[model samples]
Target: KIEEGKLVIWINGDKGYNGLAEVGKKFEKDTDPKVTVEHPDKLEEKFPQVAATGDGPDIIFWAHDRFGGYAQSGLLAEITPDKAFQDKLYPFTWDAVRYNGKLIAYPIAVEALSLIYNKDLLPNPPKTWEEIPALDKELKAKGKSALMFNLQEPYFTWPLIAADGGYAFKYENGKYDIKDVGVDNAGAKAGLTFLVDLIKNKHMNADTDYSIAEAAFNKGETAMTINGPWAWSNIDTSKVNYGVTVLPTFKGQPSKPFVGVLSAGINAASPNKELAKEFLENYLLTDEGLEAVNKDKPLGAVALKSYEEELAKDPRIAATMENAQKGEIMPNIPQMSAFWYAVRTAVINAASGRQTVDEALKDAQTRIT
Candidate 1:
C-alpha cells in the first residue's frame, strides 16, 4: 500500500493548477503530510494505462466531461461528497461530476461561452435575437461587425442550436438516451437559422476565425463576440472595455450553452484513499482553498457557492456564473464524440449557404445515428 504520509496529485497544468499548487503547500503545512504535484502532457491519453496498473497519482484534476468513461472503466473512485460540499455547488455542476448515481469528482469550476460585448458600444446587451439585426446595421454603419464568432465551429454555435431546443441526447433515468438525438430537430433548425440569417445579413461570416474575431473585438472594431475566459486574456484592456452576459434569447427561448466543469477525481487504484480524501475534501473544498485555486487568471466561475457569491461581486465572474447556472452540462457520454463532428459540419454548411438549414440539420441527424 502507498504510504499514508505521502500524497501525489496530477493536473493538466491549467492556470487553476497554480491555485492548487498553493493548496498543496498549505495542506502540507497544516497536516504535516508530504505532497507532490505533477503536470503531465497528454495526461488523458496516458491515464488509463497508468491508473489500471495502480501507478498513477492519488488524485487527478481534469474536466468532468470525461469522468463518465473514466469511472466506467474502473479508473475513478466513487467520491461521496459531504452534504455541505454537495450543497455548496450549483446543482447542475454536481450532475456533471456524477456517474451512475455516484459522485465521481469534486467540481472546482464551471465554464461556458457567453456574449462578451464592448460596454461603450453596447450599453445594454441584446436580450433577444430579434435585436441583433438592427444592432448589426448600426455597427456596420460604423464600420464594425455587430456580433461575431467562429461560426464554422460547433462550440460557439451550440448555444444557438440549443436556444431553440437542440441537444446532443435525451436524459432519462439518470443517463443519456443516446437514441434520442436532437441535432436536427425543429428547435435546432430554428436556432441555427437565426445564426445563418445573421450571415445572410452580413452581421457575421463563415470565415471569421478565432483570431479574426478576437482581433476585431480586441481592437474595438466589433461590439460583441461569443467567447469564453481563454480569449479574455488576449483582449487588450486599454483598447476594449467589455462585459460578459448570457446569450440572447432565440425568439424568446433562452440560449443554453454547454457548461464545462473542471474537477478532481480520486484514482480508484490508489492505496492512499484517506490522504487523498484529506487533500481534496478537507482542504480544496474549503473557501480558503478554493480562493487560492481561483486566483490565477480565474477563468470559470468557482464551483463553491460561498466563493461564487464573493466572485459575483466582480461583474465578469457574476456574468459567467449567471450563464453557467442556465447552461447545460456538456454531455459526458462517449457517444458525444459523434455529436460534435456531425453538428460542426451541419452549421458550417448551413451558414455558408451550401445547404439549407433543414437539409443540413437532417444530414446531421442521419450522421449521428
Candidate 2:
C-alpha cells in the first residue's frame, strides 16, 4: 500500500488544469505531508520524455478514446479494482475503460449529444418532419433563417446520422462486427436528410461555422441545434430559456448519441504501482475522494454504482447515465486508427453542396471499413 507522501499526478496539456489541480490538493489535506499533489501543464508534451526515462507520475488522467492506442503499445497497467467498488460502476462507463478484456482506464466523465431548443422562443416544439418545414417557412417570411449547423465539426453531425438509424458497428457474439458500419445505412441517411432537407427548404444557415453555432442559437437565430452536453455550463443560457432532450429521431428511430468517456491510468514506467492504485481508490474512485474533481470536471461516472446515485440527484447529469445505457463505446480496435481520416471531410463536402450524401459516404465507408 502507498504510505501517501510525494504523490505526483498528470493531466492533458491543452485543457486548463486548475479544477483538477484543486481536487488533488484536497487529498493532500487529508494525508498531510503523507501525500503531495503535483501537476505541470503540458504533460502531453512531457509524457513521452518522462515515461521513457522510467519515471513518471503515479496517476494520469486522459480521454478514454486514446486508451486503446496506449494499451496496445503496452503503456498502461491493468486494474483489478475492488469488486465491491466495481459493482457500483455504470456499465457504459465500465465498457469504455476496457481494452482486450483488461481494464486500462478508470472512467471519470462522459460526454453526450442531445437536442436542445429555447422553450420561450418556440413554446411548442415541433415533433414531426412535416411541422419543421412550416416553422422554417414562417421564420423566413419574417427574413430570419431558423437554425444553424457546425459544418466544420463532426460531433455536430454524428447525432443527425444516428437519428436516421445509421450506425458504425453491430455487435454479435459479444463483439462489434465492423462489417456492418452504417454511415451509409438508410436510417443514418434519413437523419442526414432531415438536415439536408432543412437546407433545401432554407430553414437553416448552412454557412454558419461552429464558432458561431452556439452563440447564434443563444441569440435566437434558429430555434435549436444538435449539440452535446459538454457545452452546457459555458453556454450563455441565462439570456435564453432552454430545454435538453434526446436529439430528434426520424422514422421512429430514437436518436443514438456518441458515447464519450474519460479514464485514469498508471504510467507503464511508474516507480509506484500499488501506491497509484490505492490513491485512485481513495482520490478518484470514491465519493469523498471525488468531490472536488466532480464539481468542475462535470462528467459522467463510469463506475455506475460508485457515483451514479449521488451524481444523478442533479437533473442535468442524470441523462448521461440514461444515455450510457443505450450507448456503444466507440470501438477500441487498432483498426479505428483509420476511422476518422475522412469523417469530417466527407460530411463537409456533402453538407456544403460539394458532393451528394451517397457519394461522400461511399468513399468514407470504404476507407474506414
Candidate 3:
C-alpha cells in the first residue's frame, strides 16, 4: 500500500477500468498505500444470502434502480453525501438520493435525454409532440422514414404523453395514486391516439426489438430519436452530423427528463467501512475518479457538468445539467413496477389497433385499481 492506511474498495462496472487504474496509480504515487478494487455482478443471485451475513468487499458501487430494496433491507450504508461536496453535485442529482427525506446515497453520475437527429436530412429536432405528426408528414414527402425510438414499452412513451399534459398515475395527498390510474386522462389519450394515428399514417412503426430501432436510426432511415448517452455510444457520430437539445415539454413549460445518478458507497456492516469510505472519498470524488467512472461508459457521470475542463469539450456536460432541472428520479413508490407493466400493455394494444385508446386506458385504470 502506498498510503499507510490505503483501503480496498468494491464496485460493479465493466467500464471503470481506465479512470480507476489511472487513479490507483496516481493515489499510489501520493499515498503509497494500495487500495484494492474488486467487482462482481448478478448480485441479485449471489449477494443476498451471502452478504446479508456481512462478509465482502469494503466499498460497493450501486445503481439506483434497486436502491429501494437495498436501503430498506439494511444492505447499504445510509451515509449522507458530504456537505462539502454539495456544490460539486448537480442539484437534481442530489435530489435523487433522498428517500423519505433521508439522504441514502451519493449520486455520482447523471443520465439524461438529448434530442438526437440525423443532420444529413432534418437539421433540427421537433419543438413539440404536436409538431411530430407534421414532421412525420414531412419525412414521407421526402420519401424518408419518420423518427423512431424503441416503443415496446412506456419508458419512451411517457415523455410523449408527458409532453401533452398527460399523467399516467394520478397524484393525491403526496403520493402517486395508482387507484385513479389516469392513463385515460385526455392528455394521455391524446398522446396514445396520436401514436396510433402515426402508425396508420405509415409515419411510424414499432419493432419487437431495441436493436432494430438502433439499426434503423444508424442506417439513416429514421431521422431522429430520443435516447440517452448509451444510444450515442453504439453509433458513429462522425459519420452522422447530429444535434442535441433539451427534450420538448408539456404545454411549453418543460416536462423535463428526470435525473438518475449511479453511486458507489460503503456497506454499513462491513468491518472495513471506514476504509471503504476513505477509498471512495479519495478516488470517486477526484477529477481522476470522475474520469475513471465515465471511461467507456455510454452515459457519463452526473458530476460531469462543465466537463469541457475535465473531459475536453464533451458537449454532454452542459446539456445534462441544463436539462437536470427538467427531470426527477423515476418515482420511487414501490408500486411503480406494477403500474409500468399495466401501462405498457395498454400502449402496445393501442398501437396494434386491437384496442382503442379509450378502451385500453379504461381497462388499465380498472385493472391496476
Candidate 4:
C-alpha cells in the first residue's frame, strides 16, 4: 500500500497545475519520491468514492467547505501542524480547516466578497448603504445602475443578511452549534428587509443573476457590484477602471461576508501519511513553495501572515484581505448544504413578494432544521 518512491496530489482544476508541477519537481528532487499533480475531472464526486477504497491521491487541494463531510466520513487524516507554524497563518483559516476539534487540513488562500466599483463612475466608493441613494441618483444621471450582484445567491447576499448579527450557524468555543440557526432572527429579518426594499424601490433588479450582474458591471453599465477576487480576470479583460473595497456598512453595522478558504488535506487511507505531511508542511506550505504555486495561479489572499507586506503592495489584494479579516469564516460543516438551499429559497420567496421577509426566513429556519 505504500506506493514506494511516489507521491500523488489531486487538484480540482488545471489552473494551478503548472506552478504545482514545478513545486512537485522540487519536491521530487529533495525527497526522492516522484511527485505527480493531477487535475481530475469531477474530483468532488470521485475523491470520496475512490478514497473509500484506499485508492485516492495522497493530498487533495480543494475548498475548505467540503472537508467537514470528508472528516466526518473518516476520509481525511488529522493534520496537527507545529505550533509556531500555526501561529504564522491567519486564525480564521484555522477555523475553516478544523472539524470537531481536529485540524483536518492546511489552509492556503482565502476569498470573500467586497465592493467593486468603477472608479470613473464613482470616484469615492460609498462607505455606508445610506450613501447608496445619492450614488444611485448620480449614476442614474449617467445612465448606469448604482449596484448589481447575483441578487438571489446567498453566497453573494450574505453580507447584507449578516450586517446586524445574522449568521448561518453559531460557532462558539471552536465548534459549530448547528442546532442554533440564526437566519430568521430579528437582526436577520432587518437585513433581509433592507435587501427586499432595494428591490422594491428599484435600486437593484431582482432578475439580475450572477451572469447578468457580472455582464452589466463588465460593460460599465453598473457603477458598483459585490464580488470576490475570482471575478477580477473578467473585469480586467473588460478594461473598466475599477477598485475593490470592503462592503459598505448597513445602517451603521458592518457587513460581514463569508470567507472561504482553499486548502490541502491528506487522504486518510494513504500509506504515505508521514511523507504526505512532510510534503505539505516542509515543501508546499513554505514561503518558497507558496510563491512557486503563485507563479502560475496568483494566490489571491494568502492565509499566511508573513505575506501581508507583499500583499499590501497590491491595493486590490490588500482590500480583499481587510474585508476577509472583518468577515466570518463560512461554516464548513455538512449542515451548510441545507443552509444554502434554504437561504436561496428564502431569498427567492421574499424578493418575489410570495412571502414577507419574516415569512420567508421563518420558512428557511424550519427547512434547515
Worst 10 residues of 3 by lDDT: 1-10
Per-residue lDDT of 118-178 in model 3, one digit per residue for the tens? 7788776766656777887878787776577777857666666655566645666866665
Better of 1 and 3 by lDDT: 1
Judge candidate 1 at residue 199 and give its lDDT: 86
TM-score of 1: 0.80
Candidates 3 and 4, the one with greater lDDT: 4
Pick the lDDT winner.
Answer: 4
Question: What shift in Å separates residue 51 of candidate 2 from its native position after superposition?
Answer: 6.9
Candidate 4 backbone clash number = 0
For residue 253, model 3's alpha carbon misses the true position, in angstroms, by: 6.3
Give the winner by TM-score: 1 or 3.
1
Off by over 4 Å in 2: 1-17, 31-63, 128-130, 140-145, 200-202, 205-210, 236-239, 272-276, 301-306, 321-327
Tell me the spans in candidate 1 whose CA falls farther than 4 Å from its real position. Answer: 1-15, 27-59, 82-92, 150-153, 172-175, 207-212, 229-239, 269-275, 348-356
* For model 2, the run of ten residues with the poorest summed lDDT: 12-21
**Residue-level lDDT tens digits of model 4 in 1-369:** 436557888886624666788888998898888889999887866888888887789888877887888888889988988899899888978988988888999998887788999999888889998788777877788789899999777878888888887888887896678889999998889889988888888788777898898899999999999987667767888999999998999879889888888889899988888888888878877778877876665567888877745765888888887888788877779888688889989988898889999999999999987
**Residues 1-369, candidate 1, lDDT per residue (tens digit)?**
334567788887444566677888988899887778787986865776788777788888876877777887888887877787678787977878866778888888777788999999998989988899999898888888788787766878898789878888898896678789998888999989888888888778877877788788888888999887656655644468888888888868778888888888888878777788888877987788887766654657777788778876877767776776676878776566567778989988998888999999999899888
Candidate rank order under lDDT: 4, 1, 2, 3
> Higher-lDDT candidate among 1 and 2?
1
RMSD of each: 3.9, 4.5, 5.2, 3.6
